PDB file of C-alpha atoms in Angstrom:
ATOM      1  CA  UNK A 978       0.000   0.000   0.000  1.00 57.56           C
ATOM      2  CA  UNK A 979       0.456   3.673   0.320  1.00 56.78           C
ATOM      3  CA  UNK A 980       0.827   2.977   4.129  1.00 55.98           C
ATOM      4  CA  UNK A 981       4.459   1.813   3.728  1.00 53.15           C
ATOM      5  CA  UNK A 982       5.497   5.516   3.868  1.00 50.45           C
ATOM      6  CA  UNK A 983       3.809   5.917   7.274  1.00 51.20           C
ATOM      7  CA  UNK A 984       4.517   2.522   8.867  1.00 50.26           C
ATOM      8  CA  UNK A 985       7.689   1.453   7.049  1.00 49.49           C
ATOM      9  CA  UNK A 986       7.988  -2.349   7.120  1.00 49.69           C
ATOM     10  CA  UNK A 987       5.078  -2.803   9.558  1.00 50.72           C
ATOM     11  CA  UNK A 988       3.188  -5.768   8.125  1.00 49.56           C
ATOM     12  CA  UNK A 989       0.738  -6.333  10.964  1.00 49.00           C
ATOM     13  CA  UNK A 990      -1.156  -4.369  13.660  1.00 55.40           C
ATOM     14  CA  UNK A 991      -2.749  -5.420  16.937  1.00 54.39           C
ATOM     15  CA  UNK A 992      -6.520  -5.857  17.017  1.00 53.13           C
ATOM     16  CA  UNK A 993      -7.747  -6.961  20.469  1.00 48.97           C
ATOM     17  CA  UNK A 994      -5.530  -9.829  21.592  1.00 50.78           C
ATOM     18  CA  UNK A 995      -5.022 -10.775  17.977  1.00 50.86           C
ATOM     19  CA  UNK A 996      -3.300  -9.214  14.973  1.00 46.55           C
ATOM     20  CA  UNK A 997      -4.342  -8.114  11.498  1.00 45.95           C
ATOM     21  CA  UNK A 998      -2.233  -7.618   8.363  1.00 44.87           C
ATOM     22  CA  UNK A 999      -1.685  -4.059   7.088  1.00 44.98           C
ATOM     23  CA  UNK A1000      -2.452  -5.286   3.661  1.00 44.61           C
ATOM     24  CA  UNK A1001      -6.016  -5.940   4.903  1.00 47.82           C
ATOM     25  CA  UNK A1002      -6.593  -2.154   5.046  1.00 45.85           C
ATOM     26  CA  UNK A1003      -6.543  -1.756   1.296  1.00 46.96           C
ATOM     27  CA  UNK A1004      -9.359   0.366  -0.076  1.00 44.32           C
ATOM     28  CA  UNK A1005     -10.117   1.974   3.269  1.00 43.65           C
ATOM     29  CA  UNK A1006      -9.529   5.406   4.790  1.00 46.20           C
ATOM     30  CA  UNK A1007      -7.122   4.831   7.683  1.00 46.10           C
ATOM     31  CA  UNK A1008      -7.155   7.185  10.650  1.00 48.50           C
ATOM     32  CA  UNK A1009      -3.950   7.442  12.676  1.00 48.02           C
ATOM     33  CA  UNK A1010      -5.183   8.340  16.222  1.00 48.08           C
ATOM     34  CA  UNK A1011      -2.472   9.988  18.332  1.00 47.73           C
ATOM     35  CA  UNK A1012      -3.460   9.726  21.970  1.00 49.26           C
ATOM     36  CA  UNK A1013      -2.447   8.534  25.340  1.00 51.52           C
ATOM     37  CA  UNK A1014      -3.918   7.348  28.632  1.00 49.50           C
ATOM     38  CA  UNK A1015      -2.184  10.153  30.525  1.00 48.98           C
ATOM     39  CA  UNK A1016      -3.496  12.914  28.248  1.00 48.96           C
ATOM     40  CA  UNK A1017      -6.301  14.985  29.804  1.00 50.30           C
ATOM     41  CA  UNK A1018      -8.353  16.160  26.685  1.00 50.23           C
ATOM     42  CA  UNK A1019      -7.910  12.647  25.197  1.00 53.83           C
ATOM     43  CA  UNK A1020     -10.005  10.875  27.892  1.00 51.30           C
ATOM     44  CA  UNK A1021     -13.286  12.430  26.782  1.00 52.89           C
ATOM     45  CA  UNK A1022     -12.456  12.370  23.025  1.00 52.44           C
ATOM     46  CA  UNK A1023     -11.701   8.630  22.832  1.00 54.58           C
ATOM     47  CA  UNK A1024     -15.253   7.435  23.661  1.00 57.36           C
ATOM     48  CA  UNK A1025     -16.685   9.824  21.012  1.00 55.45           C
ATOM     49  CA  UNK A1026     -14.402   8.248  18.352  1.00 54.02           C
ATOM     50  CA  UNK A1027     -15.303   4.758  19.697  1.00 54.71           C
ATOM     51  CA  UNK A1028     -18.982   5.550  19.202  1.00 55.89           C
ATOM     52  CA  UNK A1029     -18.340   6.810  15.678  1.00 55.99           C
ATOM     53  CA  UNK A1030     -16.191   3.791  14.881  1.00 54.74           C
ATOM     54  CA  UNK A1031     -18.652   1.230  16.172  1.00 53.35           C
ATOM     55  CA  UNK A1032     -21.382   2.847  14.072  1.00 54.45           C
ATOM     56  CA  UNK A1033     -19.553   3.470  10.789  1.00 55.18           C
ATOM     57  CA  UNK A1034     -16.201   1.740  10.349  1.00 51.25           C
ATOM     58  CA  UNK A1035     -17.760  -1.060   8.192  1.00 48.46           C
ATOM     59  CA  UNK A1036     -20.266   1.052   6.300  1.00 45.82           C
ATOM     60  CA  UNK A1037     -18.012   4.082   5.875  1.00 43.05           C
ATOM     61  CA  UNK A1038     -15.062   1.774   5.022  1.00 44.07           C
ATOM     62  CA  UNK A1039     -12.509   3.175   7.479  1.00 45.24           C
ATOM     63  CA  UNK A1040     -10.109   1.848  10.042  1.00 44.91           C
ATOM     64  CA  UNK A1041      -8.520   3.549  13.114  1.00 45.84           C
ATOM     65  CA  UNK A1042      -4.945   2.725  14.267  1.00 38.80           C
ATOM     66  CA  UNK A1043      -3.937   3.799  17.740  1.00 39.20           C
ATOM     67  CA  UNK A1044      -0.521   5.530  17.719  1.00 37.37           C
ATOM     68  CA  UNK A1045       0.281   5.896  21.352  1.00 39.09           C
ATOM     69  CA  UNK A1046       2.212   8.588  23.262  1.00 39.70           C
ATOM     70  CA  UNK A1047       1.986   6.322  26.221  1.00 36.99           C
ATOM     71  CA  UNK A1048       5.505   5.417  27.483  1.00 35.71           C
ATOM     72  CA  UNK A1049       4.398   2.973  30.161  1.00 35.24           C
ATOM     73  CA  UNK A1050       3.231  -0.318  28.664  1.00 36.03           C
ATOM     74  CA  UNK A1051       0.513  -0.858  31.306  1.00 39.25           C
ATOM     75  CA  UNK A1052      -0.920   2.613  30.546  1.00 40.84           C
ATOM     76  CA  UNK A1053      -0.942   1.784  26.816  1.00 42.70           C
ATOM     77  CA  UNK A1054      -2.349  -1.760  27.332  1.00 41.76           C
ATOM     78  CA  UNK A1055      -5.079  -0.480  29.582  1.00 41.76           C
ATOM     79  CA  UNK A1056      -6.116   2.243  27.140  1.00 43.02           C
ATOM     80  CA  UNK A1057      -5.924  -0.070  24.151  1.00 44.47           C
ATOM     81  CA  UNK A1058      -8.109  -2.591  25.944  1.00 43.67           C
ATOM     82  CA  UNK A1059     -11.032  -0.085  25.821  1.00 41.77           C
ATOM     83  CA  UNK A1060     -10.649   0.450  22.079  1.00 43.02           C
ATOM     84  CA  UNK A1061     -12.316  -1.608  19.315  1.00 46.27           C
ATOM     85  CA  UNK A1062      -9.808  -0.793  16.539  1.00 45.49           C
ATOM     86  CA  UNK A1063      -6.151  -1.466  15.729  1.00 46.53           C
ATOM     87  CA  UNK A1064      -2.882  -0.286  17.168  1.00 46.79           C
ATOM     88  CA  UNK A1065       0.757  -0.041  16.316  1.00 45.46           C
ATOM     89  CA  UNK A1066       2.412  -2.416  18.813  1.00 46.01           C
ATOM     90  CA  UNK A1067       3.846  -0.836  21.979  1.00 44.74           C
ATOM     91  CA  UNK A1068       7.091  -2.556  20.971  1.00 44.73           C
ATOM     92  CA  UNK A1069       7.100  -0.341  17.801  1.00 47.94           C
ATOM     93  CA  UNK A1070       6.717   2.970  19.490  1.00 47.41           C
ATOM     94  CA  UNK A1071       9.677   4.278  17.578  1.00 46.39           C
ATOM     95  CA  UNK A1072       7.573   4.017  14.386  1.00 47.95           C
ATOM     96  CA  UNK A1073       4.841   6.042  16.121  1.00 47.57           C
ATOM     97  CA  UNK A1074       7.316   8.720  17.256  1.00 50.25           C
ATOM     98  CA  UNK A1075       8.575   9.029  13.687  1.00 51.37           C
ATOM     99  CA  UNK A1076       5.019   9.220  12.273  1.00 49.16           C
ATOM    100  CA  UNK A1077       4.115  11.796  14.909  1.00 51.52           C
ATOM    101  CA  UNK A1078       7.032  13.903  13.625  1.00 52.56           C
ATOM    102  CA  UNK A1079       6.162  13.258  10.022  1.00 54.10           C
ATOM    103  CA  UNK A1080       2.693  14.756  10.459  1.00 57.57           C
ATOM    104  CA  UNK A1081       3.958  17.480  12.844  1.00 57.89           C
ATOM    105  CA  UNK A1082       1.594  16.275  15.554  1.00 54.97           C
ATOM    106  CA  UNK A1083       1.979  19.062  18.174  1.00 54.04           C
ATOM    107  CA  UNK A1084      -0.538  17.814  20.745  1.00 55.24           C
ATOM    108  CA  UNK A1085      -3.015  14.986  21.262  1.00 53.28           C
ATOM    109  CA  UNK A1086      -5.620  13.989  20.690  1.00 54.54           C
ATOM    110  CA  UNK A1087      -5.005  14.300  16.937  1.00 51.67           C
ATOM    111  CA  UNK A1088      -6.514  12.252  14.133  1.00 51.79           C
ATOM    112  CA  UNK A1089      -5.029  12.095  10.643  1.00 53.86           C
ATOM    113  CA  UNK A1090      -6.749  10.149   7.922  1.00 52.39           C
ATOM    114  CA  UNK A1091      -4.964   8.867   4.891  1.00 54.30           C
ATOM    115  CA  UNK A1092      -6.054   6.772   1.905  1.00 56.13           C
ATOM    116  CA  UNK A1093      -4.541   3.324   2.500  1.00 55.24           C
ATOM    117  CA  UNK A1094      -4.093   2.656  -1.220  1.00 57.12           C
ATOM    118  CA  UNK A1095      -2.270   5.821  -2.316  1.00 56.33           C
ATOM    119  CA  UNK A1096      -1.093   7.121   1.056  1.00 58.65           C
ATOM    120  CA  UNK A1097      -2.492  10.587   0.271  1.00 60.33           C
ATOM    121  CA  UNK A1098      -3.566  12.582   3.338  1.00 59.04           C
ATOM    122  CA  UNK A1099      -7.310  12.983   3.205  1.00 59.20           C
ATOM    123  CA  UNK A1100      -7.934  14.897   6.438  1.00 57.29           C
ATOM    124  CA  UNK A1101      -5.911  16.332   9.252  1.00 58.52           C
ATOM    125  CA  UNK A1102      -8.842  17.928  11.170  1.00 59.50           C
ATOM    126  CA  UNK A1103     -11.079  14.992  12.049  1.00 60.63           C
ATOM    127  CA  UNK A1104     -10.452  15.393  15.825  1.00 63.11           C
ATOM    128  CA  UNK A1105     -11.987  18.953  15.557  1.00 57.57           C
ATOM    129  CA  UNK A1106     -14.754  18.074  13.045  1.00 55.49           C
ATOM    130  CA  UNK A1107     -15.993  14.770  14.528  1.00 56.92           C
ATOM    131  CA  UNK A1108     -17.143  16.366  17.767  1.00 61.30           C
ATOM    132  CA  UNK A1109     -19.354  18.700  15.624  1.00 59.10           C
ATOM    133  CA  UNK A1110     -20.475  16.007  13.097  1.00 60.58           C
ATOM    134  CA  UNK A1111     -21.162  12.829  15.115  1.00 61.89           C
ATOM    135  CA  UNK A1112     -23.114  11.334  12.272  1.00 64.31           C
ATOM    136  CA  UNK A1113     -20.381  11.897   9.729  1.00 66.66           C
ATOM    137  CA  UNK A1114     -22.487  13.914   7.277  1.00 67.29           C
ATOM    138  CA  UNK A1115     -19.342  15.666   6.117  1.00 69.53           C
ATOM    139  CA  UNK A1116     -17.014  12.601   6.504  1.00 70.17           C
ATOM    140  CA  UNK A1117     -14.258  12.126   5.699  1.00 73.04           C
ATOM    141  CA  UNK A1118     -13.953  15.924   6.325  1.00 70.60           C
ATOM    142  CA  UNK A1119     -11.433  16.302   3.531  1.00 67.41           C
ATOM    143  CA  UNK A1120      -8.733  18.915   3.990  1.00 66.59           C
ATOM    144  CA  UNK A1121      -9.399  21.821   1.600  1.00 65.14           C
ATOM    145  CA  UNK A1122      -7.434  21.450  -1.620  1.00 67.64           C
ATOM    146  CA  UNK A1123      -4.940  24.039  -2.874  1.00 68.28           C
ATOM    147  CA  UNK A1124      -3.763  25.202   0.590  1.00 69.89           C
ATOM    148  CA  UNK A1125      -1.149  24.319   3.239  1.00 70.48           C
ATOM    149  CA  UNK A1126      -1.346  22.010   6.297  1.00 66.71           C
TER     150      UNK A1126
END
């Protein structure tokens, strides 16, 4: 895929106490969710993305991949246990730290959605738009063309 740029060499992701192949994300919009258990504004945003996800990840053809800023593995494990989507393994935090820099993530929560097939960036403002569009009437909230982000 186009995700090789963002998760170089990462062939699988965690899902629950299992694993899924990255290649299984083809054709979907893939949201990188930068968050952590210790982050105060993240605690109330997570459930709101969980509700959206449970509703629409199959019909709206998207996936969400937790990219943790947790540094303690029990914090990460505990937060990931409440989530219904995928994560970059805690053992591959270095890949998350590099992606965080790649997208200039300055604070969390932050959600970035990219096309899994081409790797283009489709939206960088979904954390701000989701809370005002719970039903996803403007999803995927594309970033406005012809500008900078």
